[PDB]
Design a protein around this ligand. Structure first.
Ligand SMILES: [Mg+2]
Ligand SMILES: [Mg+2]
Lengths: 218, 218
């Protein structure tokens, strides 16, 4: 009966009332309000695949002592400008962050680090901070849903997947808009289409018992 | 990298110390203490695929009034014997339950129903009751693990799967023995083998986003 599976999934998608959705988000509005750099969890980690570890260490020591060895590689120019500015105490306008690569080599953003030293500029620099650096958003808002997405849900959203689950919500793409439905509606329409489903924490290539296995990429 | 997946799963299995397992259960001991009929969730439902619905209804009415229409089909002979005995008040020895098909046509077991009318015989009839009809077992015992298994975990155990997950435990089959490990050990050995995994609520034939889809059989 697994041969009719694609047809049943199409029937499943067609059962939803897209005008009675919980909320809906245009993909364009999501890309305007959140650069991909500010969604992906890897932006919160030290940028070990972009800078040598010794260069990241040399930046932290420079930010601590505000004197001494400057890092070498010419890809540290902008992070050096940022670090020297905090040490010299000179100001960086919100337009400087809008111009930057946003992500600091030690993980997180320039804006969040700058707002930790100058908390009066927090609100104006919020658009340049990672979602995981911003305060807990109000329930039902786009930021709230994004902050509560695991890496797999974020990756599915960034890649524009036709559908993905995130917690207690189903995200369904119709055209260039995502429609959210609660899991009760998800399960009801899966029942009617003759479907069962599972939410994955990775891809599934080999199943043993009730365990889906996958190689991790890194 | 998905081509090396079977080799990585074999390495994963080989990393476990089977002598330092949480607990272990011989498959033979499980089959001795629990007939499959007393594990599968479908035994708790009315036996609609074995008896006509009208015959099940005729049995409930007979058990209520203790008079009137006897069901027809000759597959109801033993359930009729059981029902007439409760009505006549005659006793059924534990050996009668050991001889029976265990499962009552309305779902559940003969033994549990009999022990509801004669609670003094509960302990002697416990071996003939469904695991979901028995009291909550003590933690760490075989019955405890079985009572907390979803249908998918039960089906994997009944079918003798090489491995399956159930809650916070990994069940690993080596020979004819199942070895239990906590999920921390599961994840540590998956990390070292270069693997990611997900626990399924059904099979996975088509993946959309982070959702594994499957047709339900019924
Ligand atoms: Mg993968
Ligand atoms: Mg299946």
């Amino acid at each position: 009966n697994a041969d009719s599976l694609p047809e049943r999934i199409d029937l499943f998608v067609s059962l939803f009332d897209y005008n009675s959705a919980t909320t809906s988000y245009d993909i364009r509005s999501i890309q305007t309000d959140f650069p991909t750099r500010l969604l992906t969890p890897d932006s919160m980690l030290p940028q070990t695949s972009e800078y040598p570890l010794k260069d990241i260490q040399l930046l932290y020591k420079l930010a601590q002592s505000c004197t001494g060895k400057l890092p070498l590689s010419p890809l540290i120019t902008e992070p050096l400008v940022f670090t020297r500015s905090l040490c010299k105490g000179s100001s960086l306008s919100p337009r400087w962050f809008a111009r930057s690569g946003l992500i600091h080599p030690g993980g997180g953003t320039y804006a969040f680090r700058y707002a930790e030293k100058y908390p009066a500029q927090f609100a104006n620099l919020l658009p340049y901070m990672h979602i995981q650096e911003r305060p807990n958003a109000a329930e039902g808002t786009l930021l709230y849903h994004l902050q509560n997405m695991g890496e797999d849900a974020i990756n599915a959203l960034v890649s524009g997947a036709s559908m993905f689950g995130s917690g207690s919500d189903l995200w369904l793409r119709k055209g260039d808009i995502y429609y959210l439905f609660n899991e009760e509606t998800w399960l009801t329409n899966a029942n009617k289409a003759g479907l069962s489903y599972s939410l994955l924490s990775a891809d599934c290539f080999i199943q043993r018992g009730n365990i889906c296995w996958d190689v991790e990429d890194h």
